[PDB]
Amino acid sequence: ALCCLWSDWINEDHPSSGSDDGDRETFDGVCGAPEDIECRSVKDPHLSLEQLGQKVQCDVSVGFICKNEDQFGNGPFGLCYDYKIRVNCCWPMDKCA
Ligand SMILES: [Ca+2]
Ligand SMILES: [Ca+2]
Numbered sequence: 001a002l003c004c005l006w007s008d009w010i011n012e013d014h015p016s017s018g019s020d021d022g023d024r025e026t027f028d029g030v031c032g033a034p035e036d037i038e039c040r041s042v043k044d045p046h047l048s049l050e051q052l053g054q055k056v057q058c059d060v061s062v063g064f065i066c067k068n069e070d071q072f073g074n075g076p077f078g079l080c081y082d083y084k085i086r087v088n089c090c091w092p093m094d095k096c097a
Pocket of ligand 1: 013016017
């Protein structure tokens with residue numbers, strides 16, 4: 001009885017853009033509190049996080065966080081993929097019919 005829908009992709013940050021040395025995606029201004037979140041690599045969007053092999057955080061409280069230094073590599077090499085997220089948002093059933 002809760003009408004749920006997945007948002008469009010959000011991709012506002014990039015691993016070599018901004019000042020965070022990583023990729024963070026938020027659902028602020030899209031959903032108040034998402035029921036679920038889907039985090040995918042831009043270049044390989046069919047691969048779930050379980051198939052992707054990076055060290056990231058993806059959850060319904062903080063959204064998506066990847067820190068470049070957490071990724072495989074040595075010296076200056078190795079960083080986050082660029083990620084995008086959808087959020088699953090739910091509303092009363094009377095908003096679906
Ligand atoms: Ca960045
Ligand atoms: Ca991104």
